[PDB]
Ligand binder design. Structure first.
Ligand SMILES: OC[C@H]1O[C@@H](O[C@H]2[C@@H](O)[C@@H](CO)O[C@@H](O[C@@H]3[C@@H](O)[C@H](O)O[C@H](CO)[C@@H]3O)[C@@H]2O)[C@H](O)[C@@H](O)[C@H]1O
Length: 461
């Protein structure tokens, strides 16, 4: 039962609430290490916890790799977004983070630490504003500002540190020295004046991807991403990822989960309790699979429950009810199907002859109220009303699950095993266009006209 419940606070093997807010993760040896920070009673840096696991679901407490006692300036300060990266050359784990006074946010500087072991007590080095010696001034103080940050290890073995500079208006990608403990140069300035925060830098197939969020404090916002063949330049524009609130969370880190089957990228987020007036320690987590439609097209679906099998390297949706179904039209006798039995995103939904194919099988996931999710089997995508249309003739397609109301359907029994499937968005029924009785009939959205082409029978398979 390697299943995770989003919008909650995961508990370690001890039965205690895990506290690794704004943290990250590292895969070394046979274990996945989850680092993160958490405040205390005075809302100040208490320690950077570390959790270990092989299955990515059951986490074991390993103590504070970094404490407010590790250094004199760590006593009264704010530390957030601690990330850990490994150095093959040295053989030591270097840790970066964001440091503040604890009184204000004027000292926008980064901090560094390291240890010979992953779950061992890290030794604090220093806190500083990148390029301090260069003499450059960034808003009153010497050295570039450095708030929200993150680390990245490239294939060639070069380390990289990214953070928000120039009053969170610009993103600075710093290239680290071979030891990872220092900054060698300013690789490139990314997304100037666009004000992107909580950056996550990853790589897949010669393509670099940068997942960022907006700057609105606790308030969840529209997350975005970009791609490029080179870190220095060639970066694309910003493309929306997830919904308008990133499913009520803010991105913190993204790691490739490699296994026997293949590689599945995991998304980590934070549901900051500050949204509803709660303390930082009351923040919950949101883990979702990061799917790659193409080298240039990304998908971030929302599953209320996610199943993970680290061994095989597979991250998919958890269906509470594996019962398969077929939707037969009263008028045509055809069943609900996907065009060309495609698994592509936004694939057109059509009616087709009952051929017992996978494309013609659907799950029914309750999503609160009297509404449900109609999910295809051959492709984990959900039945969706294209472009959240509220008009007659609105085409129906299969789209990535995003909790939108245009993906919620209520079944209304009319007798004899037939139902009227209305959308939660406008209330229009699932309709076979023009009363079509042939294969490939476009499935659409239409007002309840009492037609038999709008009536569907639910059949077990
Ligand atoms: O009014 C709100 C908002 O609605 C968006 O509708 C989008 C969503 O319904 C989304 C799933 O929730 O599905 C989008 O379908 C898009 C399609 O529009 C585009 O042409 O192709 C992509 C991928 O192929 C995808 O299928 C749908 O657009 C509107 O998009 C948005 O403008 C806004 O109106």
């Amino acid at each position: 039962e390697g299943v995770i419940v989003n919008g909650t606070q995961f508990k370690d093997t001890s039965g205690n609430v895990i506290h690794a807010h704004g943290g990250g993760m590292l895969k070394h040896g046979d274990y996945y290490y989850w680092y993160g920070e958490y405040r205390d009673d005075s809302n100040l840096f208490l320690g950077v916890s570390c959790y270990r696991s092989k299955d990515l679901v059951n986490w074991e407490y390993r103590g504070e790799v970094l404490s407010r006692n590790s250094a004199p300036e760590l006593n009264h300060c704010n530390i957030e977004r601690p990330k850990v990266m490994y150095n093959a050359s040295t053989g030591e784990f270097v840790m970066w983070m964001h440091w503040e006074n604890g009184i204000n946010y004027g000292q926008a500087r980064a901090a560094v630490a390291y240890s010979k072991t992953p779950d061992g007590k890290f030794t604090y080095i220093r806190s500083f504003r990148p390029m301090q010696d260069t003499g450059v001034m960034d808003h009153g103080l010497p050295g570039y500002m450095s708030r929200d940050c993150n680390v990245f290890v490239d294939t060639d073995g070069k380390g990289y540190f990214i953070s928000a500079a120039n009053e969170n208006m610009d993103l600075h990608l710093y290239e680290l020295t071979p030891d990872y403990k220092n900054i060698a140069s300013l690789k490139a300035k990314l997304f100037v004046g666009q004000q992107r925060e909580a950056p996550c830098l990853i790589k897949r197939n010669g393509y670099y991807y940068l997942i960022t969020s907006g700057c609105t404090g606790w308030n969840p916002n529209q997350a975005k991403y970009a791609y490029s063949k080179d870190l220095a330049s060639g970066w694309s524009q910003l493309y929306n990822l997830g919904n308008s609130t990133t499913y009520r969370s803010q991105p913190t880190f993204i790691i490739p989960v490699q296994g026997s089957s293949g590689t599945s990228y995991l998304y980590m987020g934070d549901r900051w309790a500050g949204a509803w007036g709660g303390k930082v320690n009351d923040s919950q987590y949101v883990w979702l699979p990061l799917n790659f439609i193409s080298d240039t097209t990304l998908e971030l679906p929302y599953y209320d429950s996610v199943k993970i099998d680290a061994s095989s390297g597979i991250i998919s949706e958890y269906i509470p009810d594996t019962t398969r179904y077929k939707l037969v039209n009263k008028n045509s006798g055809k069943v609900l199907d996907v065009l060309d039995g495609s698994v592509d995103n936004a694939a057109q939904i059509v009616q087709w002859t009952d051929n017992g194919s996978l494309s013609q099988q659907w799950y029914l996931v309750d999503v609160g109220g009297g509404y449900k999710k109609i999910v295809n089997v051959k492709s984990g995508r959900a039945l969706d009303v294209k472009d959240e249309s509220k008009e007659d003739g609105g085409v129906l397609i299969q789209y990535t699950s995003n909790g939108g109301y245009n993906q919620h359907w209520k079944f209304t029994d009319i007798g004899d095993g037939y139902y009227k499937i209305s959308s939660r968005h406008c209330g229009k029924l699932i309709d076979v266009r023009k009363w079509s009785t042939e294969d490939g009939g476009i499935i659409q959205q239409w007002s309840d006209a009492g037609g038999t082409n709008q009536h569907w029978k639910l059949v077990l398979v």
